[PDB]
């Protein structure tokens, strides 16, 4: 458990804490270039125009190529989705299989005092592998949650990895007010090369979590291999090895492992 | 219980957390286009005019077709209604039937130790199906709350689903100050093509919860089918199967399910 | 109890939560129309003038008919009164009759173990209806609190129901500064058709709680009818039926209702 | 106790909650009328001048009659005094006489089990009225705190009641800057009919608590009459009746009042 | 104890709560009179000039007489000192003599059960006055903390009492920028009759705590007199009377004072 | 302990509470004098220029003598250092020697009940001075933390004490924009006698803590003298006297000090 | 443990508290020099331009040498990384080896009462060094976390140490709007010597933590030397010495170390 929950707790809580660091350095959200002192107010109107006129205009105003890419408005918004999706395979196990393993935790904790009174009787335990001999496909339904997470992190690396090639010239563009021209056709200049503010801290934020999660993806692959190096294949590890390790989950007893020092001599 | 409460808790708390994400990115609420520097103040007066002059003007100022559709002013407001309505069939069961099942939880917990002392006596339980033989229509009054929720999510999909076809050109419109013209008929220009700000993040917010709740609607249909695949029809499942599963609600005992491993050998 | 407290707790806490939703969307409170750039400050003075000059001017400045109707300045203020008045008949019972029924809760809880040791003796309860034979008019003083609430909700429906007919043209009006003219009679124009901002969200807020409380008024009428369908009239229900149901208030015992399954066989 | 503490707790906590409702609708505090765009700043200087020049100017600038009435600057400030003064006769009793009655609570709780073992002995209490036969003037020192509160609420009704006759024309007045004229005698106009903002919500706030406390003043008069209707006059009620009722303060016992149902038969 | 701690707790916590009431009504801190629209900014510079140029200018700019009286900049600041200084003689006793009296509390609590088993033996206490016969000058070191507080409140009445005679014309004055003239000697006018804002609420705040603490000063004098009216002079009250009253500090026993009712008969 | 922790807790928590009082009265941070209405913005640029151009300019712009004294920008910043440095010799003892004295607290608490059962046996303790006969230089490592604190407070008095002589004319100075002149050499005037705002409340803040800590420095000298007046020199006080006083640290027993009253007679 | 956790807790919590001190003195973030009153708004546009145009412009606009050094935008951002990286080797041990040493804490706590009943038997312990005779390479996996931290602090000293040589002239630079010139080539001047604000408090902040962590780096070197001065080399200290010291971790017993005083005599 605790080899997994080091990842499963600290790493999703890393990214929202990283997401909170963006919120301190917001300041404003976008600026525009007014045409030389026509008001304080209509300049604010033109600035608020194009920031909402990003995605509805299906026409080509950015001349960038694949320019309706929605212009990364959602880096807190998408990271909010990816954080809570990683939170589920812990909580899915926690409310559907962690009580069933807590029964198994109780089931092994009466198995250990059975060895304890056997040593007191030394002054039936061999059946318990036959109690755990069957198929029990519900454990395989538990083990897929680690495989389920691996899909999420992989496309996350594709999602962040597309941004760096996207980060060449995706800040400066042309906007206009076409229907507001259509009401008068008189006074307002058409184009205003406005400029977004987000890429200066976001592009250098997308370096970190990608190269972190790249350096953490083989660890989950390693997590599905400790059952492989312990004498049974993954179709036959069904109950034995995921009970051998979770023997060391809550605690131990006074003669759980001090027997071996007695056994050494 | 816990197969339902995974939906019943996390999914309504999803949408208010989604509703809180809107409140960070409010900024302003609407902008307008002043007629070229007449004041700082009267421009603010004209902007605050039309934002309240949306629904009272029964005349056709938007030339959009069915234009008094109230212009989606209420996406936090309607989602506040739908979140708390889903909260009720948990709380309706929790304050009217969860203590009655807690008595039944006590009633089955004395049934299980009766099997326990029977094994101690091995060193009357057969009557309990006849204790649960009657009609008990109050359980059917409990089971309709899942059916009650299904009505709410269905029209929610109609409510959000109408918005995407609504999202074609429902942002730009014409407004005026007619009675303020009627006081002088002298100076103020009539029409001002103002522009709302909400659709840029709301239309791309209404994608998510609809396609989530579409991918969750057959799960509640599946919830009313585990009584069907367990040897009695829905008119005859009255007490047996909703007590068989809630046997695994709070906890188990040391020989609740370890009997089967003893029974296997 | 719990059939009533579902209404008595959630419904007054509904309306203050609805009242809190108004406070997020305040923004400003009123705007006015200045006469074309005379200052930033004197325009703010004229705007703050008429917002306080609403009710003191007993003259007819609105030409609306019954125009000193105080112009609904108090929708958070009146709802604050109606919320706390519904809070009293719970708390009036809670600090004056709930300990007396808690003594009766203790009085019936020693009556139930008297039946329990009678079953142990099977290996005087018939007197208790004669202990509850008298008039006990203090219970009728308890039961009027439900009738007391019904008066409050009825006139609340009249209060909110008057607003929709009031909502025709009760936003736009004429104001002036008459004594400020009287100091100089020189420069200031008289009338300024200012405009309030509140009706755009308040009129569509008064739809909800009215149609909710209309759909909840017969439930309290139903609450005074469960004593009617249980073999005694309301002058004779005095103690028996309001003790029969509150037997199921705190909890039950192991043979409170499992006797019936023993009695069935 | 609990007949009094329903008033003694909820009613002072009512008025500070009413005082908190003022703080949300502050906005600004006073406005003034500048003489037509001389600065943004000196207009703010003249506005801040007269708001502090209210009470120091002993001359007649308001021409209202008794015009140094300090102009109700202190409605949160005075209500802060009246709220905490009502809080004292609870707390004065709570830290000086409530432990002494808690000893008496212990003293009567050993008197009740003395009746309990007497019924066990049925398978000396008559002395306790002679234990409570003396004068005990300290109880009369307790009972004056209710009389002490009645003085406070009475003059509070005079304080709020003077405001409605005061509310005729106590908002508009004349102010000037006399010494600032005395430095130059050149440029500044003298009088500026400024206008306060507070009376629009305060005068319609002073309706409520006055008519509430008028409808609560005879209740405290009724509180000093339950000792009168129970066979001894107020000079002779000294200990008996204020111990008869506080017998029902904390709790009761299993045969405190179930004796009467045994006594009925 | 509790006759003192009613003063010692509530009265210092009164004044910081009074000090918090100032912080809500701050708004701004000082205003000045600009010379008729030279900038928004340099007017703010001149206003911030003189507010720091109050005390460093040892010259006579106020022409008031004793004009470097520092102009009461410190009414939250000085009240912060006087509040925490009153907090010390509680806390000085609490961390140096309250455990020693808690040992004495334990010492008298074994003296009371010695009387209790003596009544059980009725089915050596006379020595305890001789255990408390000595000088014990450490108790006189405790009793001076009440005398220590009396010095603080007395000069506090002098401190606040000097302010009312100070409050005649200590708000309006003359300021200038002399070295800023010395850089150019060209453009800036010299004098600007600025005006402070603090005296309008502070002078009418200094009425209250003075007349409160005047009406509380003889109570502490009364506190050093209950040892005088109980048969020993203040040089001889050393241990007996400050243990007689603190017998009633924590609690009593079942026969601590019910002995007297047994002794009455 | 408690004679020290009265200083060690309340006095560092005094200064941060004093540091918090500065943060309420910040307002702005510095002002400057613009050259007569060139913009709102470039005036803000010149003001923000020199506030960062304080310490980097190694040239002589202040003509004050030792003018790169960094101009007391750090009075919250330095006081933050001095507060947390005083917090360490408590916490250094608390996590390295307070458990070792808690073992000694346990070690003396079994020594006291050994005297208690000796009195029960009256119906070996003399060895314990020989248990505490050795050198135990770790106690001298504890006692230097009081000496360690004394160094910090002494230079703190030098640090604050240098400020008053510094407070003569260290607010007004000359600044310029030299490289901004170097880009054009055309328009901008060179010098602007700006003015800081901090000394008006800081110089009269540095009076207090200095004269407080001067009046507390001999108390720590007195703290290292109670071992001197109790029959052994500071090289020989090693364990006896710092265990004699901490006998009275947690509590006492029923016959810890009541033996002396038995011993008196 | 506690010799390490004095560093491991207080020193990372030092730097975030130091990081919080920056956030109070933010104010603004950057200023620029407008070209002499062209608007309020376009000046704000040019200022927001270059603050985002820092790192994307790969051209040489600063003429400083290695000028794309990203200009220390990340001093809260980088310190956030270094603080949480130091937090891991505590938490890595805490969730993977602290329960295993808590089992060893239980394992030694039954070893100590074995000595206790041996003294009771005086009215097998010698085997326990042979229970701790093996290799146990997992302890060496624990001890590398101190070595892991030392790498982080070393390059932190390189990171902060590069800043002081960087702090010569890394604040003033040249910026322009090249594509905004490219749209018109008409009106806007090219270069504007803007100026950052951060180095005035940051360069004098980077003094402290570097010279602190330099004065703490040999302490961790000393931490890996207490196993060296206790009779076994670091390849042979495997279990004995890291159990000898953590014997004094939680507590001791009444005869854990009082045996030595018995052993002295």
Swiss-Prot record, chains A, B, C, D, E, F, G:
Effect noted on mutating residue 201 to V: No change in glycosylation pattern
Ion transport keyword on record: yes
Tagged with keyword Zinc-finger: no
Keywords: Calcium, Calcium channel, Calcium transport, Cell membrane, Differentiation, Disease variant, Disulfide bond, Endoplasmic reticulum, Glycoprotein, Ion channel, Ion transport, Membrane, Oogenesis, Phosphoprotein, S-nitrosylation, Transmembrane, Transmembrane helix, Transport
Extracellular side: 28-72, 168-195
Signal peptide: none
Disulfide bonds: 32-194, 50-175
Residues of this chain annotated as glycosylated in UniProt: 184
PTM per Swiss-Prot/TrEMBL: S-nitrosylation inhibits channel currents and ATP release. N-glycosylation plays a role in cell surface targeting. Glycosylation at its extracellular surface makes unlikely that two oligomers could dock to form an intercellular channel such as in gap junctions. Exists in three glycosylation states: non-glycosylated (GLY0), high-mannose glycosylated (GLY1), and fully mature glycosylated (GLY2).
Coiled coil: none
Any GO MF annotation of the entry: leak channel activity
Post-translational modification S-nitrosocysteine, affected residues: 6
GO cellular component: bleb; endoplasmic reticulum; endoplasmic reticulum membrane; gap junction; membrane; plasma membrane; protein-containing complex
Tissue expression: Widely expressed. Highest expression is observed in oocytes and brain. Detected at very low levels in sperm cells.
UniProt GO BP: ATP transport; calcium ion transport; cell-cell signaling; monoatomic anion transmembrane transport; monoatomic cation transport; oogenesis; positive regulation of interleukin-1 alpha production; positive regulation of interleukin-1 beta production
Membrane-spanning segments: 7-27, 73-93, 147-167, 196-216
Residues modified to Phosphotyrosine: 128
Protein localization: Cell membrane; Endoplasmic reticulum membrane
Membrane topology: Multi-pass membrane protein
Catalytic activity: chloride(in) = chloride(out); iodide(out) = iodide(in); ATP(in) = ATP(out); K(+)(in) = K(+)(out)
Record function comment: Ion channel involved in a variety of physiological functions such as blood pressure regulation, apoptotic cell clearance and oogenesis. Forms anion-selective channels with relatively low conductance and an order of permeabilities: nitrate>iodide>chlroride>>aspartate=glutamate=gluconate. Can release ATP upon activation through phosphorylation or cleavage at C-terminus. May play a role as a Ca(2+)-leak channel to regulate ER Ca(2+) homeostasis.
Sequence similarity: Belongs to the pannexin family.
Subunit text: Homoheptameric.
Involvement in disorder: Oocyte/zygote/embryo maturation arrest 7: An autosomal dominant infertility disorder due to oocyte degeneration and death, which may occur before or after fertilization.
Name of the protein in its database record: Pannexin-1
Species of provenance: Homo sapiens (Human)
Gene giving rise to this polypeptide: PANX1
Shown residues in whole-protein numbering: 35 to 336 of 426
């Amino acid at each position: 458990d605790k080899m997994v929950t080091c990842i499963a707790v600290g790493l999703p809580l890393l990214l929202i804490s990283l997401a909170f660091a963006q919120e301190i350095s917001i300041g404003t959200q976008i600026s525009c270039f007014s045409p030389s002192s026509f008001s304080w107010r209509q300049a604010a109107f033109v600035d608020s125009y194009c920031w909402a006129a990003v995605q509805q205009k299906n026409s080509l105003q950015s001349e960038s190529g694949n320019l309706p890419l929605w212009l990364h408005k959602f880096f807190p918004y998408i990271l909010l989705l990816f954080a809570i999706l990683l939170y589920l395979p812990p909580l899915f196990w926690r409310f559907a299989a962690a009580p069933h393993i807590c029964s198994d935790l109780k089931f092994i904790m009466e198995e250990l005092d059975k060895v304890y009174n056997r040593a007191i009787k030394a002054a039936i335990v061999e059946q318990y592998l036959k109690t755990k001999k069957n198929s029990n496909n519900l454990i395989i339904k538990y083990i897929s949650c680690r495989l389920l997470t691996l899909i999420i992190i992989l496309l996350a690396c594709i999602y962040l990895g597309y941004y760096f090639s996207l980060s060449s010239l995706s800040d400066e563009f042309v906007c206009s007010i076409k229907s507001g021209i259509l009401r008068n056709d008189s006074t307002v200049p058409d184009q205003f090369q406005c400029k977004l503010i987000a890429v200066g801290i976001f592009q250098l934020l997308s370096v970190i979590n990608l190269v972190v999660y790249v350096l953490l993806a083989p660890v989950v692959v390693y997590t599905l291999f400790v059952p492989f190096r312990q004498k049974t294949d993954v179709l036959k590890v069904y109950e034995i090895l995921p009970t051998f390790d979770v023997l060391h989950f809550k605690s131990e007893g006074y003669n759980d492992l001090s027997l071996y020092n007695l056994f050494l001599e």
